[PDB]
Amino acid sequence: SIGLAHNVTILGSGETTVVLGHGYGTDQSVWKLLVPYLVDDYKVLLYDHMGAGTTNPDYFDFDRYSSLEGYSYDLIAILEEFQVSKCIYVGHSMSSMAAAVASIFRPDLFHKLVMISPTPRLINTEEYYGGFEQKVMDETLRSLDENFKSLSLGTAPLLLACDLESAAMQEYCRTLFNMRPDIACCITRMICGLDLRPYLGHVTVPCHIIQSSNDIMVPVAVGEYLRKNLGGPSVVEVMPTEGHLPHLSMPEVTIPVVLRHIRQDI
Amino acid sequence: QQMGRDPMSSIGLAHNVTILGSGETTVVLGHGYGTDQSVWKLLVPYLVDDYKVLLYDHMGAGTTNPDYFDFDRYSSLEGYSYDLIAILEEFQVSKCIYVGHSMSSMAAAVASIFRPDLFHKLVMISPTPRLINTEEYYGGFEQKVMDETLRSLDENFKSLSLGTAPLLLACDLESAAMQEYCRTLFNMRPDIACCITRMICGLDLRPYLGHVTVPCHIIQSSNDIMVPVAVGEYLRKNLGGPSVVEVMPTEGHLPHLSMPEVTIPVVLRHIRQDI
Active-site amino acid positions of B? 102, 224, 253
- Give the active site residue among A27, A48, A74, A215: A215
All residues of chain A having their beta carbon less than 8 Å from the beta carbon of residue B113 are 150, 153-154
Instruction: Output the CA angle A191-A194-A197, nearest 5 degrees.
Output: 140
Residue B144's Cβ-count burial label (10 Å; 0-12, 13-18, 19+) is exposed
Query: Chain centroid to CA B29: how far?
Result: 9
What pairs with residue B101 in β-bridges? B125
Chosen from B71, B78, B214 to mutate, greatest number of chain A CBs within 10 A: B78
Round to whole Å and give the CA distance between A86 and A18. 9
> Cα A14 vs. chain centroid, distance in angstroms?
24
**Which residues have C-beta within 8 Å of that of residue A217, sequence separation ≥ 6?**
A93, A117, A119, A122, A131, A159, A244
Interface of A with B (CB under 8 A): 149-150, 153-154, 157, 163-165, 170
- Contact at 8 Å (CB) between B56 and B130? no
Task: Give the determination technique.
Answer: X-ray
Residue A208 is among the residues annotated as catalytic for this protein? no
Q: Which residues of chain A neighbour B204 with C-beta distances below 8 Å?
A: 165
Which residue of chain A is at minimal alpha-carbon distance from B202?
Answer: A165
* DSSP secondary structure letters along A167-220: HHHHHHHHHHTTS-HHHHHHHHHHHHT---HHHHTT--S-EEEEEEEE-TTS-H
List Cβ neighbours of A58 (8 Å cut-off, separation of 6 or more).
Answer: none
Chain A residues inside the 8 Å CB shell of B203: 165
Flag if A164 and B211 touch (Cβ within 8 Å).
no
Round to the nearest angstrom and report the end-to-end CA distance of chain B: 47
A229 annotated binding-site participant: yes
Query: B217 pairs with which residues across the strands?
Result: B123, B244
The strands making up B96-101's β-sheet, listed across from edge to edge, are B18-21, B52-56, B26-30, B96-101, B119-125, B216-223, B243-251
B205/A150 Cβ within 8 A: no
Domains contained in chain A, number: 1
Residue B161 φ then ψ, to 5°: -75, -50
What Å resolution does this PDB entry report?
A: 2.3
Q: Give CA–CA dist A194/A132, Å, rounded.
A: 12
Vertex B56 angle, CA B55 and B61, to 5°? 140
- Phi, psi torsion values for A124, nearest 5 degrees: -65, 160
Beta bridge partners of B122: B98, B216
Q: Can you say how many angstroms the Cα of residue B205 is from the centroid of all Cα atoms in its chain?
A: 14
Q: In this structure, is the dihedral angle defined by the CA atoms of residues A234, A240, A246 and A250, taken in order, positive or negative?
A: negative
The phi, psi pair for B28, rounded to 5°, reads: -110, 125
Could you tell me the strand order of the sheet in which A43-47 lies?
A9-12, A43-47, A17-21, A87-92, A110-116, A207-214, A234-242
Instruction: Tell me how long chain A is.
Output: 266
Alpha helices in chain B, H assignment, sequence order: 11-14, 78-90, 103-114, 143-155, 157-169, 176-185, 190-201, 206-209, 229-238, 255-258, 260-272
CATH of residue B192:
3.40.50.1820
Collapsing DSSP to helix, strand or coil, B135 comes out as coil
| CA atoms of A99 and B230, how far apart (whole Å) | 53
H or E segment and range at residue B123:
strand B119-125
User: What is the spatial distance between Cα A43 and Cα A20, in angstroms, rounded to a whole number?
Assistant: 11
CA distances from B45 to A4, B12, B72, B99 (A): 67, 22, 37, 15
A93 classed as catalytic: yes
Contacts of A227 (CB under 8 A, 6+ apart): A207, A209, A234, A235, A236
Contact of A52 with A26, CB cutoff 8 Å = yes
**Mutating which of B76, B117, B201, B204 best tests the A interface, going by the most A Cβ atoms within 10 A?**
B76
Burial letters for A129-162: b for 16+ Cβ neighbours within 10 Å, e otherwise? ebbbeeeebeebbeebeebbbbbbbbebbebbbb
User: Which residue, B186, B115, B198, B123, is CA-closest to B154?
Assistant: B198
Asked if A215 is an active-site residue, the reply is: yes
Q: Domain range holding B8? A: 1-275
Nearest to B139 by CA among B207, B238, B224: B224
Q: Among B110, B203, B207, select the one facing A170 at the smallest CB separation.
A: B207
Distance CA A170, CA A163 (A): 9
- The 10 Å Cβ neighbour count of residue A61 is 12
Amino acid letter at B178? M
